[PDB]
Design a protein around this ligand. Structure first.
Ligand SMILES: Nc1ncnc2c1ncn2[C@@H]1O[C@H](COP(=O)(O)OP(=O)(O)OP(O)(O)=S)[C@@H](O)[C@H]1O
Ligand SMILES: [Mg+2]
Lengths: 53, 584, 261, 53
């Protein structure tokens, strides 16, 4: 909250998640997930992302 | 947008980025200049709030208003208590339960030990500050007293730096058309007398003689900028005329430019810069457009040659109303001296100039004198102290002195002019028609040889009034040479400064004769000279007569005895109009 | 003729006096040029024989041996300290264009006076130098505009430490020279920069009158409608009869920094 | 934990071992020194009772 308010402009790269393998199992020999829950602030892109998918 | 930071950050919300990009598209396609376009940080939030509170089916207009006010008071008391993260207990304490489906309230739940708790929170601290400002603006366990003045002084000290943004958003909201739009959106009338209260606060701050506790000049500029109300800005900026501002960001440039443009009662302005020409271009353009300006203090600013070129281009505008401009220690040189000469020859409003600590050089002075000798040159007073000049440019200096009809006072001390340079200047200053009045050779390395030439100048020119020769070891021979001319009735000098002149007790009789005869001089400063107790006694003996028309004598840095101090005090009290400054 | 051999860095023959920068009651300063090296330095000479009791000059030389090691951006550089010509010889950095004593006189010519921004920019550096030397237990004996120098780049260099320009409250009712005497001198210097004049000017130039003026701590407050309230009160705190009433060097430095920001 | 005995013994109950291991995980990932961390024998029982009822 506070930093992003200030500028949050510092170099803070992260590891991104992809979209095609959102339902794939965590490991490689487990069971695939059967529910995902997108959550975000109000008007942040939930519906547009659903339409894009 | 990238210029503004409070927006660049909150531009992650895609809706709040669209709300700001369509806003610029409107100006772009409605025949307007974005370079002068403004994007206040409060309009974005107003539009965001309006877009979010879409009526989800006609139901509970009063309910929506009440829940918005409850959330608003929540934000207000949270900002007062530094409550970044609220809790269900506080949300119940404030009129709230459900309904408000996390538009600006995201239930982030934190697990500690064995179980996790709610810990409601706002989408962002700036958003919460905006909601606190809306709580203040809007019209009605107890949340912080709605005293706008109380919040204002809390923003004015008391270590509440976390109120600048709430005040800024209050100013953004008190906007007339924006306030009306919010009223039409939420079906709730607003109070405008808060605007007059804020105006009276700004009046107090301006009638505080640069009190700059916290709500300093730049902070008030930012507040008015976010206000964006033209009439209010005009009516409020009138108390500013003495303004001292410094810039560190493009946002500072824009705020200062808009505030100055809206200012109608501005005379004295001092501007500083940190870390240029691109933003300074517009800043100085707005300054030149201003028609009530009188002063421009650019001292202690690394303007550079490009900066000086931009400044002279701006000053060349026919509407320029700048009378005084001080450029001390601005990193100027001969190259910018060309444009300075162009400005001097073109503009007919310039009156005085000080370029102390400027790397003018012989070439710089050569370029400068070209403008000075122009018929349109109306400059009167020039300061070039410590300009690294030498006697080489003294030829051009004397030519300009004998040519210009307005240049009167010139002070070029702290330069290696030398005896030859002083003689060159004197050969032209001796002209009785010469307009030179006050001459300063501060620490110019003058000797007794130029003393005779200066005496000839004093006897010939009748327009010289004040003479400063500090830093020159004239000696007793030079003192006598000067006295020979200043005793001449044609001498019209009034003040003579000769400190650090390397004067011994021999010049005591010279100065006694000058005191007994000279009928024009009024002030004599001679400190940093070991004239002696004998000299002081003889001078006081001559002074006790009623024939001493002089009024000021300065013997500072002279060390005497108790007897001499008592005699000096007795003389000063016997002649109250004649003052002798000899403090320890 | 036969100039003194140019072997070491402590000799008059190794210096060429271009001119006399000034002549104080205690020292005479000339713009010398190191022949061996080839840079323009300041050569200050004091007649040790006059006020040479043999109990102060030896300690003065021993202590001034420490001073070249004093390396701060805001303090004059101490090059040499020796004895020659029956008087001392101190080689230091030369800052002629920058001299608050001349700057105040030049500004007094114009009705408009110095700006708060510039005074703060210089005062932060002055506080930095004072704190840096005090933290090593070393003090500026006398702080005055005539001994505070600046440069073209905007840096403020503290001059060589020496009735003085500023009479400390501890000097009056003489008991010693405390760390707060430097604070008092610095506050008086702030007042002098602010008003172009020291806080103890007046027609009554008698020692008793000025001493009682210092004791009562009565001065014409700086122009409120041109200087800041916090600065006008900081000068008041630094100018106080009580030794501990004066805020510490670190305190004044911190406030100066927060204002320069 | 092994330093404390009254806990090492009652750590056979898997729930009462999880209640003590998550407690240390919180300190470990909340920027704190476990070498100076404390694990009082009564907090574990309070959390156990709360989880049970
Ligand atoms: N992927 C995207 N790229 C650019 N703009 C977007 C994107 N997604 C959404 N937007 C903008 O954001 C607006 C709304 O985004 P949404 O995520 O649909 O809001 P929303 O979350 O559906 O509103 P709520 O929270 O469901 S009431 C759209 O009108 C777009 O202009
Ligand atoms: Mg959605």
């Amino acid at each position: 909250l506070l930093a992003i308010g200030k500028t949050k402009t510092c170099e803070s790269p992260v590891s991104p998640i992809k979209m095609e393998l959102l339902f794939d199992p965590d490991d490689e020999h487990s069971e695939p997930v059967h529910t995902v829950v997108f959550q975000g602030a109000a008007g942040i892109g939930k519906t547009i992302l659903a339409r894009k998918m | 947008i990238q210029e503004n930071e409070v927006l660049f950050t909150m531009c992650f919300i895609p809706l709040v980025c669209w709300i700001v990009c369509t806003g610029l598209k409107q100006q772009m396609e409605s025949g307007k200049s974005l370079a002068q376009t403004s994007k206040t940080t409060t309009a974005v939030y107003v539009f965001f709030l309006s877009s979010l509170l879409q009526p989800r089916g006609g139901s509970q207009e009063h309910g929506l208003c009440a829940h918005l006010w409850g959330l608003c008071s929540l934000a207000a008391d949270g900002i007062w208590n530094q409550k970044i993260l609220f809790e269900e207990s506080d949300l119940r304490n404030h009129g709230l339960q459900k309904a408000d489906v996390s538009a600006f309230l995201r239930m982030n739940l934190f697990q500690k030990e064995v179980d996790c708790e709610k810990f409601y929170s706002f989408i962002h601290m700036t958003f919460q500050e905006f909601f606190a400002a809306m709580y203040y603006l809007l019209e009605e366990l107890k949340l912080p007293s709605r005293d706008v003045t109380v919040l204002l002084e809390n923003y004015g000290k008391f270590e509440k730096g976390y109120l600048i943004f709430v005040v800024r958003f209050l100013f953004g909201l008190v906007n007339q058309e924006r306030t009306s739009y919010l009223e039409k959106k939420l079906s709730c009338k607003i109070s405008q007398q808060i605007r007059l209260e804020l105006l009276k606060w700004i009046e107090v701050k301006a009638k505080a003689k640069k009190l700059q506790i916290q709500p300093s000049q730049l902070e008030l500029f930012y507040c008015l900028y976010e206000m964006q109300e033209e009439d209010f800005v005009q009516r409020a900026m009138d108390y500013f005329p003495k303004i001292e501002i410094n810039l560190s960001t493009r946002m500072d440039h824009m705020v200062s430019s808009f505030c100055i443009e809206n200012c109608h009662r501005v005379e004295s302005l001092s501007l500083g810069f940190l870390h240029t020409s691109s933003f300074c271009r517009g800043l100085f353009s707005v300054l030149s457009t201003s028609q009530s300006l009188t002063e421009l203090d650019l001292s202690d600013n690394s303007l550079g040659d490009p900066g000086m070129r931009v400044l002279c281009e701006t000053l060349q505008h026919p509407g320029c109303n700048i009378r005084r401009l001080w450029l001390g220690r601005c990193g100027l040189s001969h190259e910018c001296c060309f444009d300075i000469s162009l400005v001097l020859s073109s503009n007919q409003k310039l009156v005085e100039l000080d370029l102390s600590d400027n790397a003018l050089g012989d070439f710089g002075i050569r370029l400068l004198c070209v403008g000075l000798k122009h018929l349109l040159c109306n400059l009167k007073k020039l300061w070039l102290v410590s300009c690294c000049l030498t006697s080489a440019c003294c030829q051009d200096l004397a030519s300009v002195l004998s040519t210009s009809h307005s240049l009167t006072r010139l002070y070029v001390g702290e330069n290696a002019l030398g005896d030859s340079g002083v003689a060159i200047l004197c050969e032209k200053a001796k002209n009785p028609q010469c307009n030179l009045q006050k001459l300063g050779l501060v620490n110019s390395g003058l000797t007794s040889v130029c003393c005779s030439a200066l005496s000839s100048v004093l006897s010939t020119n009748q327009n010289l009034t004040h003479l400063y020769l500090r830093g020159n070891t004239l000696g007793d021979k030079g003192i006598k040479l000067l006295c020979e001319g200043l005793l001449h009735p044609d001498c019209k000098l009034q003040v003579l400064e000769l400190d650090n002149c390397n004067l011994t007790s021999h010049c005591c009789w010279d100065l006694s004769t000058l005191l007994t005869s000279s009928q024009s001089l009024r002030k004599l400063s001679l400190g940093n000279n070991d004239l002696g107790d004998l000299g002081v006694m003889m001078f006081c003996e001559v002074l006790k007569q009623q024939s001493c028309l002089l009024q000021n004598l300065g013997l500072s840095e002279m060390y005497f005895n108790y007897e001499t101090k008592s005699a000096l005090e007795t003389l000063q009290e016997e002649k109250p109009e004649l003052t002798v400054v000899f403090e320890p | 003729k036969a100039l003194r051999p140019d072997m070491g860095y402590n000799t008059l023959a190794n210096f060429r006096i271009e001119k006399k920068i000034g002549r104080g009651q205690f020292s005479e300063v000339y713009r010398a040029a190191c022949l061996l090296d080839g840079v323009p330095v300041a050569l200050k000479k004091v007649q040790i024989f006059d006020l040479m009791d043999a109990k102060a000059r030896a300690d003065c030389i021993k202590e001034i041996d420490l001073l070249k090691q004093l390396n701060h951006p805001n303090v004059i550089k101490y090059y040499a300290s020796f004895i020659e010509d029956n008087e001392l010889n101190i080689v230091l950095e030369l800052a002629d264009a920058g001299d608050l004593s001349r700057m105040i006189k030049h500004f007094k010519k114009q009705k408009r006076l110095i700006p708060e921004r510039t005074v703060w920019k210089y005062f932060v550096q002055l506080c930095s130098a004072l704190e840096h030397m005090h933290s090593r237990r070393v003090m500026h004996r006398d702080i005055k505009p005539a001994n505070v120098f600046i440069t073209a780049t905007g840096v403020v260099k503290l001059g060589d430490l020496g009735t003085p320009y500023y009479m400390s409250p501890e000097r009056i009712h003489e008991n010693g020279y405390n760390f707060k005497s430097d604070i008092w001198s610095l506050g008086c210097l702030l007042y002098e920069m602010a008003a172009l004049q020291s806080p103890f000017y007046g027609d009554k130039m008698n020692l008793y009158s000025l001493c009682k003026k210092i004791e009562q701590c009565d001065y014409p407050p700086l122009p409120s409608d041109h200087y800041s309230e916090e600065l006008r009160q900081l000068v008041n705190m630094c100018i106080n009869p009580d030794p501990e009433k004066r805020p510490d060097v670190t305190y004044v430095y911190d406030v100066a920094k927060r204002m320069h920001a």
